[PDB]
Amino acid sequence: AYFPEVLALYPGDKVLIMGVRVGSIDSIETAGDKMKVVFHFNNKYKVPEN
């Protein structure tokens, strides 16, 4: 995912669905004027494409 700004977010922070932990955040690196954040969520849960 690309964000305009990524503040106080670090690798290993939790990923939530409806407030329930489903995964974590792998890495955060600068991509030009954006911030590229690679995260993951457990394959048990399904997430809509949009």
Binding site: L9, Y10, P11, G12, D13, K14, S24, I25
Partner: protein
Amino acid sequence: RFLDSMGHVAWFVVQAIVHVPHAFRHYRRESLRLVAEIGMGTGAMAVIGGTVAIIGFVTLSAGSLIAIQGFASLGNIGVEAFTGFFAALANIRVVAPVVTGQALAATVGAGATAELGAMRISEEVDALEVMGIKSISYLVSTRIMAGAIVIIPLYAMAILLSFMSAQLVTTIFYSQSVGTYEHYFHTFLRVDDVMWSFLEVIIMSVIVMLNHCYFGYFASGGAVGVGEAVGRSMRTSLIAIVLVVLLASLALYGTDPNFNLTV
């Protein structure tokens, strides 16, 4: 009496200090043997790891206590992301130096007191004096050099294991994210504090070794008196360690606390 006892211990410590170069030049193999014996223990305690294992267990316990109570209290209040910030300042400032000092006192100091008392009772100090050897230089100065050489690795392991235990308890048992813990740990920890803590631990270890060598060197009463000497040395070592840590922390951070959060 009291002044006489203070003068006797002052003479002992002065004589032990002034013979450090003599021990370093004349006795190198003995210093290496004592370094190995202190680092890896002796007797029945050596098979479990010696001083290293005891130091590791006690420091892991202290770090776990810090993380446990800290996270509980902050979660009750609500501001629980500061645990990594709270644990580090807990370990460096107060907990790790004192705890490592008490464990080092127990293991190394009691072993040294027992060894020197056994040598005194078995007339081995008399044997050394008969053979034209400075007993204090051969025994106490060698112990001091071995302790000075061994303390830095021991306290490095103690600090490492305390940090590891606090982080593991917070981020595994309490399921806090590792990123937040590492951020608040590495942001609010100053290496200057760690360097000054290492200096405190070195001074404390020298004082502890001197005290225990004094109690073991002048033992009396056969095998029974050695245990009483060990107990008295342990009491004195506890008092000295706590006093040293308190004085050093008062001197270092009396004016500049060396910590900034607000504007």
